[PDB]
Amino acid sequence: DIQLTQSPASLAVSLGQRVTISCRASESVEYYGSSLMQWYQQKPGQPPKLLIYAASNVESGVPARFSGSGSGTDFSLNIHPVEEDDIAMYFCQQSRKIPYTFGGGTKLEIKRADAAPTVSIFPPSSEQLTSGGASVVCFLNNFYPKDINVKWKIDGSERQNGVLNSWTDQDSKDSTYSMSSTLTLTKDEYERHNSYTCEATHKTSTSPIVKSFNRGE
Amino acid sequence: DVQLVESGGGLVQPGGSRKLSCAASGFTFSSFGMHWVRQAPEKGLEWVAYISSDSSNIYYADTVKGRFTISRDNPKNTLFLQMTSLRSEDTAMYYCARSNYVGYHVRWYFDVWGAGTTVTVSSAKTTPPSVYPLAPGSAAQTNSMVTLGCLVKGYFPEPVTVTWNSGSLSSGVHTFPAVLQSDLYTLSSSVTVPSSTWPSETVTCNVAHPASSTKVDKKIVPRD
């Protein structure tokens, strides 16, 4: 099939600045003097919206700040004065061969000043322990940029199984990101150890933020 | 007001079947070819099938070739997708989309999209969540702000809503998207408030899970 590679996977912008994202095809999508490539934007929990068709044709209704160009295999969408409403996901879509494919998308996010996460750790609740399970939860809130890593240490060494993670979308109020990390254990394994550590590595600091609690309290 | 409103989505056991209907309203439905496009959670868009405005041609993504059949009823103006031998991976939001010609036929593009209907293929049975209070320790509190939270675990199917004090606390809240471990969903929520407020005043997380008609108000109490 025809592969569509979009880049970057995500871009941080300042409203008012120019924006340009590209889309490449593993094969040509040109057909008798015309490129059959489209651009679609999509906002969380909502259906895609057509912006450009045939590489450069600007669908009726979409602002002039938008424009598209390219041909052959290379294409690109341009939002010169990028504004609030443009913060969303952008997909690449061809109509040349079947199956008709879409690119992996490029997410435009609000550029903001770096921020270190606020980390909090919580031991399993009595209610859960009564059920034979034990979850240790850790929140890494309001940090920027998005990239962050979480490492779970038990008594002193790291754990990698039974660790489930979740990330929020960028916050509309402060433009930061948040993550939630849960380490689940059986109650017996939870009671054979004392130290539960949550360590977060983010761009802000080279020295991991460390949060932990010891049983016996 | 050209639009498409697909319906028919819901829960299905692996191997089961389900019919999807797309209701058009505001254009010569008999002139425009139609498409079905799906999007798995957190995933991208995957074209599913296309049908002529004349039921002349119908194309399927190999991924559903011998299991899904697309059809159109020009009169009642509706598009259908018949799903059978459904698998876990068929789980996605299903979109209804009108094709369109700028120069002529081959030079087409997806013109309009409906709000879509969800389709979840699972063997899991409806299951209320377990709501566990997330409270810090006595001294291990520190600062002027304190963070508390709720762990909503092992429920099915999605969705679940969470509020703090029925909404009185909206700022400084973070409820994370659910993660599907095994065949059950798990999610969490945190809320940050001033230290001079918690132990002293109540902080409750309200969890709602309609599929099981569950409404739980878990009060966050201090740990002895």
Question: What structural domains does chain A harbor?
Answer: 1-112 (2.60.40.10), 113-217 (2.60.40.10)
Q: How far apart are CA B55 and CA B10, in angstroms?
A: 27
φ and ψ at residue B91, rounded to 5 degrees: -65, 120
For residue B34, give the DSSP letter: E
Query: Which residue, among B117, B134, B160, B175, would best test binding to A if mutated, counting the most A CBs under 10 Å from its CB?
Result: B134
Decide if A35 contacts A24 (C-beta within 8 A): no
Q: Which residue type sits at B42?
A: E
Q: Which residue of A has its CA nearest to B39?
A: A47
Technique employed here was X-ray
Question: With an 8 Å Cβ cutoff, are A137 and B147 in contact?
Answer: no
Resolution for the entry shown, Å: 2.5
Q: How many CA atoms lie within 13 A of B7 on its CB side?
A: 4
Question: With an 8 Å Cβ cutoff, are A213 and B111 in contact?
Answer: no
Pick the closest to residue A180 from A194, A167, A198, A190 (CA basis): A167
**DSSP characters over A74-89:** EEEEEESS--GGG-SE
What is the topology classification, in CATH, of domain B124-222?
Immunoglobulin-like (2.60.40)
Question: With an 8 Å Cβ cutoff, are B136 and A120 in contact?
Answer: yes
What is the topology classification, in CATH, of domain B1-123?
Immunoglobulin-like (2.60.40)
Q: How far apart are CA B34 and CA B55, in angstroms?
A: 9
Pick the closest to residue A123 from A188, A208, A178, A197 (CA basis): A197
Q: Which residue of A has its CA nearest to B63?
A: A99
Decide if A138 contacts A180 (C-beta within 8 A): yes
Decide if B136 contacts A120 (C-beta within 8 A): yes
Question: With an 8 Å Cβ cutoff, are B140 and A124 in contact?
Answer: no
What is the torsional sign of CA B175, B177, B179, B185?
positive
Place of tokens 């592969």: A3
Decide if A140 contacts A111 (C-beta within 8 A): no
Count Cβ–Cβ pairs < 8 Å, chain A vs chain B: 130
Place of tokens 């520190």: B142
**DSSP characters over A141-175:** EEEBSS-EEEEEEEBTEEE-SSEEEEEPPPPTTT-
- 3-class SS of residue A71: strand
Find chain A residues with C-beta within 8 A of B176's C-beta: 166-168, 178-180
Decide if B134 contacts B191 (C-beta within 8 A): no
Find chain A residues with C-beta within 8 A of B116's C-beta: 47
- The domain spans of chain B are 1-123, 124-222
Pick the closest to residue B44 from A18, A93, A145 (CA basis): A93
- Domain B1-123 and domain B124-222, same fold? Reply is yes
